[PDB]
Design a protein around this motif. Structure first.
Motif: not given
Ligand code: SRO
Length: 256
Positions: A222-232
């Motif tokens: 779930d590291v990818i989703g947590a990165l995506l949530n702030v990279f958006v």
């Protein structure tokens, strides 16, 4: 909250740029019309998709809005973001043409240039985003992931990133390299032009490039989703900076 300032900054800055274009008579040209179209695209982004994303944040990614409106939120997000990216790509290409051979650019520089450029970038932004609303309103399985609005159709994601960011990235890297190669007492002004081009290009790369790299690496892996949530939201920060870094180099916008 940090996202509370970004919506106000975007809505204030784009209104200021459009009001400065409308009010100052010296800023009536083709390039400033294209820049007003860019500000329109980011203002529509910051008005339509950005408080929705803040609402998604405040509920912990469990979507409060009902399920009929998911396919249009991805549509508005992809449409306005592709509009902004193709706006910057067309601006870089027009700067390369207007810097490499300035006589033949000004020979063909009508207002038809600006209207055809706006038509081309908005037609491209509509056409790339075309499979989003037709295949999402009745088919909720392709635009939902564990009860949240996300592009689960990775076959859309990979090809759409390829046509929307990475081919614009490989166009703007080449045009930036050849524009720096073509800019090598006009020697004092060329350094300021080079500094502005460098700041704008590397700021675009820093603002948009983490999100698309981790977005493609999500489908490749779930590291990818947590990165995506702030990279958006890092990607949304480009739409508040793009009025500033494209206008404040000219003192007429600061005097407005
Ligand atoms: N927030 C949506 C950003 C975006 C712009 N263009 C895109 C293309 C494909 C994709 O998955 C996403 C995008």
């Amino acid at each position: 909250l940090l996202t509370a300032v970004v919506i106000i900054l975007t809505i204030a800055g784009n209104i200021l740029v459009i009001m400065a274009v409308s009010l100052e008579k010296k800023l009536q040209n083709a390039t400033n019309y294209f820049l007003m179209s860019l500000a329109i695209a980011d203002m529509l982004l910051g008005f339509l998709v950005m408080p929705v994303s803040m609402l998604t944040i405040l509920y912990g990614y469990r979507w409060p809005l009902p399920s009929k409106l998911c396919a249009v939120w991805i549509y508005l997000d992809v449409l306005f973001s592709t509009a902004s990216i193709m706006h910057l790509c067309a601006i870089s290409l027009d700067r390369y043409v207007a810097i490499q051979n300035p006589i033949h650019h000004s020979r063909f520089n009508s207002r038809t240039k600006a209207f055809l450029k706006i038509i081309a970038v908005w037609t491209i932004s509509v056409g790339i985003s075309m499979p989003i609303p037709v295949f999402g309103l009745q088919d909720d399985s392709k635009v939902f992931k564990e009860g949240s609005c996300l592009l689960a159709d990775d076959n859309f994601v990979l090809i759409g990133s390829f046509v929307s960011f990475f081919i614009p990235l490989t166009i703007m890297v080449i045009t930036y390299f050849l524009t720096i190669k073509s800019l090598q007492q006009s020697i004092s002004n060329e350094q300021k032009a080079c500094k502005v081009l460098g700041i704008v290009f590397f700021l675009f790369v820093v603002m948009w490039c983490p999100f698309f790299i981790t977005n493609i690496m999500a489908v490749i892996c779930d590291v990818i989703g947590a990165l995506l949530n702030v990279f958006v939201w890092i990607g949304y920060l480009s739409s508040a900076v793009n009025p500033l870094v494209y206008t404040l180099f000219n003192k007429t916008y600061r005097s407005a």
